[model samples]
Target: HHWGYGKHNGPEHWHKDFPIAKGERQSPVDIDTHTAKYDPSLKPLSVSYDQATSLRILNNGHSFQVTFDDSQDKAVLKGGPLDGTYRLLQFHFHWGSLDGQGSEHTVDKKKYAAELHLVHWNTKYGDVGKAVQQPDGLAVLGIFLKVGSAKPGLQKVVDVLDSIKTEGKSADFTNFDPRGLLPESLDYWTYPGSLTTPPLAECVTWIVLKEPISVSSEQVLKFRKLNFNGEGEPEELMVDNWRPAQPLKNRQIKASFK
Candidate 1:
């Protein structure tokens, strides 16, 4: 039951409720670029999505997620570190209350403004629910967000946040393409990791892009306005919702670019 980003019930206390919190494959690791090995065999990642598959947005007391209809391969991630096609289930973000404190994963101990996770389940396996607990069952595209010029593509999502600002709130969002959030380069670092939340399962093949996308200060503030509590409850701001970095034990991060 220890699921939150507070000082008392936060990450340090998670291992009490979820024993796997101390597992070797836990996520949000400090990615040391110099230590990563360059693998020429690693192919470029291929991502395809249908605007029609976009469903709605949800404030699941965690982060705002843009869910999709995974009944078909309308959105899929291939090549790169994946051995099979993985269908996109949803995408979410992790951020702090302000700039420079948001991102889940850091490079050389340098944090970014935020991070986006496009979670996908292996089609070769079963569904997203069951796949999440098994090795190679999930593939997450981790795109770092830096503070800079306002991202025109992300403005659409930002505009909708006011609609679902409280926990358990959700709103219909369709025909929004997910590709616009990605950077120009597909270069990334791949490794084994787990979900960054409670029920933290070690089933993810993490593909963290090297190139980061930009967002404005105003856009970052909108995310911090989300509350962890329900509509009638006292407002508990959902800022600093990202998990801290975990140990990278016996894991070698392979780079898609030199």
Candidate 2:
């Protein structure tokens, strides 16, 4: 059977097909800030996205994502916990039905309304497929979203939700700046972790930012309007798409700020 966010195919049952779901360095761990060691050596994160490189937005049966053109390094993520440059592949979100909970990685056990993941692959690895198999081949920047004033960046994404309401649907979404989605401060917590979804490969260097961006209740409602099923299938609202926090398991989370 295919994987999904439903009770039967959700995160709890992922280990049945993907054994690595229970392996060491699993992702979406609860970040205990008090214990996170401050790393002086960790440099500030560098992100540069060319607006023209944003190709399209689509609902991929799992979550909606804005894909980018990675043929060249026009959109790249560098510094921070990453060694070499990583090309931007795509970005997606995990959210809940309510405003109180939904984020994957929580801060001090506090869940945000949602979480955004900007996925990137190391240029050293040649391609994203190969990068997913290596320990240091992927870097994912996590940004939390809280319910508050509406975000213009997020609004742009929400405006197009109607066109791709169901799975496998897509539309041109060019000239979009992913950088506008980032919070003002780049302070973050870094750790080694795996993909939050199935096939759960432990290849990501997770850089979860400390501050969260704001999105209005109306904007979040638009996200819930998306259907997890394909056209003509039984419609199911795409909510609570987040995987619960996993065990830190001997991993040390390093804070880029004191």
Candidate 3:
């Protein structure tokens, strides 16, 4: 039942509806005016939400990841001569082997039924997962989930999706606080990416957030009742699968506080 976001089904045409996501490696980007010179050195860190945000939550049969330690919630940003210091390391989701849609990152080209990536690094150079395989480490924070018309209010991340049902269950509830699920209107859009799947780690630094959130239709079928089929210890499918959109050669994109 795939169907979410339109206009030729956004993300530059999801590899014609999943053709093995065209050998995915982060996908979708369509901007034609980036002149860079942005300099901010943005720094924002402060997180200790009842400890235990994630140090492991892999389901991996089809989707669902959550690696984070060092007590997450770090930050940094700069453009020109590229500067970095971002560290927020873990937040995952993306699905659509059959849900509404999957997600990669698409805005003006639209595409989103689900997608959430908070991954960060640039810990100066290396840290968590070895700085996502360096290039300047990584920095991701893409968000987009659709259902709209007054459905989004996310109820604290769908209240932990029934405690990680199926495929390696998880649900130890904590103080929980991803900055209260930021979304007041930071209006973002930066680029230079990598990591949408596989050893695809181009030391990302993408932040695509321009307001978009919602979860209905029964919380998107309870996030597809996560369960990536494995059998004896591999069954997994934590919802919203992705890997379709990546190739912004000569990359360059921007739009913040714009």
Q: Each model's TM-score, in the order given?
A: 0.98, 0.98, 0.30
The alpha-carbon deviation from the true structure for residue 149 of candidate 3, after best TM-score superposition, in angstroms, is 36
Full ranking by lDDT: 2, 1, 3
Stretch of 10 with least lDDT, candidate 2: 46-55
Model 2, 15-63: lDDT tens per residue? 9999999999999999998999999999999888753388999999889
Please give the range of 10 consecutive residues that has the lowest summed lDDT in model 1.
Answer: 46-55
TM-score of 2: 0.98
Residue range 1-258, candidate 3, lDDT tens digits: 232233444334544654534443344564333453243543332223344454555554545556556444433334423464465656767756454467766654556787777776665655667777776677677777776543444455565765565556554443445655556565666776676664455667677777766666676666777665544666444554565556665656666643
- C-alpha lDDT of candidate 2 relative to the true structure: 0.93
**Model 3 regions lying over 4 Å from their true place:** 1-54, 58-63, 71-84, 97-100, 107-116, 121-164, 171-258
**Candidates' C-alpha lDDT:** 0.91, 0.93, 0.57
Tens-digit lDDT track of model 1 for 77-133: 999988998999999999988787989999999999899999999997768888986
TM-score, structure 1 vs. true: 0.98
What candidate 1 gets wrong by more than 4 Å, as runs, is 50-52
Top model number, lDDT: 2
